[model samples]
Target: SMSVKKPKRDDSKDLALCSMILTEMETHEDAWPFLLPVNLKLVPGYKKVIKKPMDFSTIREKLSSGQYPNLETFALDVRLVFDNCETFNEDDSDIGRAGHNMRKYFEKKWTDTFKV
Candidate 1:
């Protein structure tokens, strides 16, 4: 079975982003941008499966460690990688088709864990 390309740097960026969000919330409780990109959407029926109760607790433990601590750097690195990516842009139709198998992989994983 294929898997999402394991980009070590990308994983680091994600962890960094998670840490930054935690620190910012602690200092400035009043003003903080929780969602920077805006209107990010998950696929239908993903809410329950992707984010379960255990997920939040696990994340909380990681943040308390205080090791990963640079939101800007993380976001920049992640965005740079995304910017340089060669996605299927030949035609709009191709996106759904090309992404079909990947989507199926995600769906199968989700279905295995949660009823959908």
Candidate 2:
């Protein structure tokens, strides 16, 4: 047979889910702070405090570049965006609250997608 055997569907489904989450995240009302890289000059301390800052644009770039070999690998950067925000901003700050909301949105979608 010329056709090759198909594999488990999770790989394709997982990739599509990543794209879906990213699209929603970009449009979220709370996504502003996490949309792009922090301005180094304006947010001077951010560079020092968050050694590996992350954002939605960067995550999208990686996805487009095929840098993530799997969903687990892709997730690390997504979580890092929230983790960096928590580290740099107080829980009560407006930006901090946005980060929390985004993280919650991501985590819930994450679980729901892989649910059995």
Candidate 3:
């Protein structure tokens, strides 16, 4: 019971992946809408509809502050960010396309970057 699986959980791997993905996502052209948050000016009832919204700016801050101890924790918000998009944006809409594209990029990059 003493010896469990212990690898490089020293706390850099999670942050490193998050930072790289944030940089990549931020530089992405489709990143415009996702950079900030959906507030009153952008959408009339975004808060009401979303209940909980996630954005890159907030994510970056968390990463900067070393808030994410595991990729799963960070990924939960990442998935939520896109899920909000999927809920609000229709497939044919411009913003929706960006959401889809961004999701695709994240999926590919995440998989390629982390085998697990």
Please, what is the whole-model Cα lDDT of each candidate in the order they appear? 0.35, 0.89, 0.85
- Which pairs clash (backbone N, Cα, C closer than 3 Å) in model 2? none
- Give the C-alpha lDDT of model 2: 0.89
**Model 2, 30-115: lDDT tens per residue?**
99998999998898788778889888999999998999999988899999999999998989899999999999999998898776
- Candidate 2 is scored at a TM of 0.89
lDDT tens string, model 3, 7-93? 664455767877898899999999998998787576877868887889999898988887877888888888889999999999879
Q: What would the TM-scores of all predictions be?
A: 0.23, 0.89, 0.87
Question: Best by TM-score, which number?
Answer: 2
Better of 2 and 3 by lDDT: 2
Candidate structures ordered by TM-score, highest first:
2, 3, 1
TM-score between model 3 and native:
0.87
Runs in model 2 deviating more than 4 A are 1-9
Provide the RMSD of all predictions against the true structure, rounded to 1 decimal: 16.4, 4.4, 2.2
Question: How do the residues 1-116 of candidate 1 rate in per-residue lDDT, one tens digit apiece?
Answer: 28866654344445544555434433433212111321226334334333322122233464556533644443343332223221312323433333343334333533443332
Off by over 4 Å in 1: 2-9, 31-59, 64-116
